[PDB]
Structure 1
Amino acid sequence: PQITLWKRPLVTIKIGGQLKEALLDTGADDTVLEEMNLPGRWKPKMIGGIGGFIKVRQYDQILIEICGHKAIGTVLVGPTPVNIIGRNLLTQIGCTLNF
């Protein structure tokens, strides 16, 4: 749908049979999820934001259903305060900014 920005743009996601709520984040190049139970192989990686850097697990070709729109891409898992859906997955559901 069309989302106004008067509140945090949170959506219900389905990942690994698990339901979570995540932030549609146009300021994020990639998707970063709070620690969760994810299956498969991964390779260590670190990401930086406001306040510094955190160490994350990099998972590729991860299925995630975002508000009924399905996308597959890299998902990072680590000590983020909030689940954030970055542009790597927003592009797959056809998300655009409009002003």
Structure 2
Amino acid sequence: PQITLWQRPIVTIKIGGQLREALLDTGADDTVLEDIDLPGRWKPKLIVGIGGFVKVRQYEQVPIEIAGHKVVGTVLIGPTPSNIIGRNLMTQLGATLNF
């Protein structure tokens, strides 16, 4: 799609049967979801946001569907006021910003 930015750019995502919504954030290096579970071991990571640091679980090479497009990449699970899709997965959609 072509998405204008008058409202927040929210798309549907799906991870192993969990259907959720998330924000396309070109200021995010990484993808951070709160309302999802993923199986097995993770790597604990601290990440930086505008308001401070947060502890997340890092899961690698996760299959995920974003606005109906299947991609694979790292997903971080932890507290956030909004689910966020970062550049790590937006590059897999071939996303561009046009300005």
Q: TM-score, normalised by structure 1?
A: 0.96
User: What amino acid is aligned across from residue 61 of structure 1 in structure 2?
Assistant: Q
Secondary structure in 2 matching 1:91: helix
Q: Which runs of 5+ in 1 are unaligned?
A: none
**Runs ≥4 residues deviating over 3 A:** none
- Identity, % of aligned positions: 80
Which structure 2 residue ranges, 5 or more long, are not aligned?
A: none
**Is contact 1:16–1:39 with CA below 8 Å preserved after alignment?**
no
Aligned pairs for 1:56-71 within 5 A: 56-71=56-71
The aligned length equals: 99
Deviations 1:3-51 (A, max 9, x none): 0000000000011210000000000001000142211321100101111
Separation in 2, partners of 1:6, 1:35: 26
What is the TM-score when the length of structure 2 is the normalising length?
0.96
User: Equivalent residue for 1:41?
Assistant: 41
Query: What does residue 55 of structure 1 align with?
Result: 55
